[PDB]
Amino acid sequence: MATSSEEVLLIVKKVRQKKQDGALYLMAERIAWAPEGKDRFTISHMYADIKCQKISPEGKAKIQLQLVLHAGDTTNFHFSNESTAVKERDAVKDLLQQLLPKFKRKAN
């Protein structure tokens, strides 16, 4: 709050997760989740606040990612529709591995 406001990266009003289907919000340092609501999110896990990353949507069901909390909490998420399980979500995850470099440098 020293410049303006938080900076979010992307939001997906449509998301499916073995628990529920709900809209997924991605923030620079965290992943948020929400259900049929307004424009906020039911939850938000700070990428640094969470540590575990598995990328399983390259040739899988239809785009599902998995992250775990330094604690013992996992975060599984999926996107999919009659025909919306593709690029859309594709880029979503594409963001995931894009911020992954913020709280965890993978390569120099």
From Swiss-Prot:
Compartments, record wording: Nucleus
Source organism, top-level taxon: Eukaryota
PTM: (Microbial infection) Upon Rift valley fever virus infection, interacts with NSs leading to ubiquitination by the NSs-FBXO3 E3 ligase and proteasome-dependent degradation.
Assembly with partners or alone: Component of the 7-subunit TFIIH core complex composed of XPB/ERCC3, XPD/ERCC2, GTF2H1, GTF2H2, GTF2H3, GTF2H4 and GTF2H5, which is active in NER. The core complex associates with the 3-subunit CDK-activating kinase (CAK) module composed of CCNH/cyclin H, CDK7 and MNAT1 to form the 10-subunit holoenzyme (holo-TFIIH) active in transcription. Interacts with PUF60. (Microbial infection) Interacts with Rift valley fever virus NSs (via OmegaXaV motif); the interaction leads to TFIIH complex proteasomal degradation.
Family statement drawn from the similarity comment of this UniProt entry: Belongs to the TFB1 family.
The protein's role, per its UniProt record: Component of the general transcription and DNA repair factor IIH (TFIIH) core complex, which is involved in general and transcription-coupled nucleotide excision repair (NER) of damaged DNA and, when complexed to CAK, in RNA transcription by RNA polymerase II. In NER, TFIIH acts by opening DNA around the lesion to allow the excision of the damaged oligonucleotide and its replacement by a new DNA fragment. In transcription, TFIIH has an essential role in transcription initiation.
UniProt protein name: General transcription factor IIH subunit 1
Lineage per the UniProt record: Eukaryota, Metazoa, Chordata, Craniata, Vertebrata
Gene: GTF2H1
Residues of the full protein shown: 1 to 108 of 548
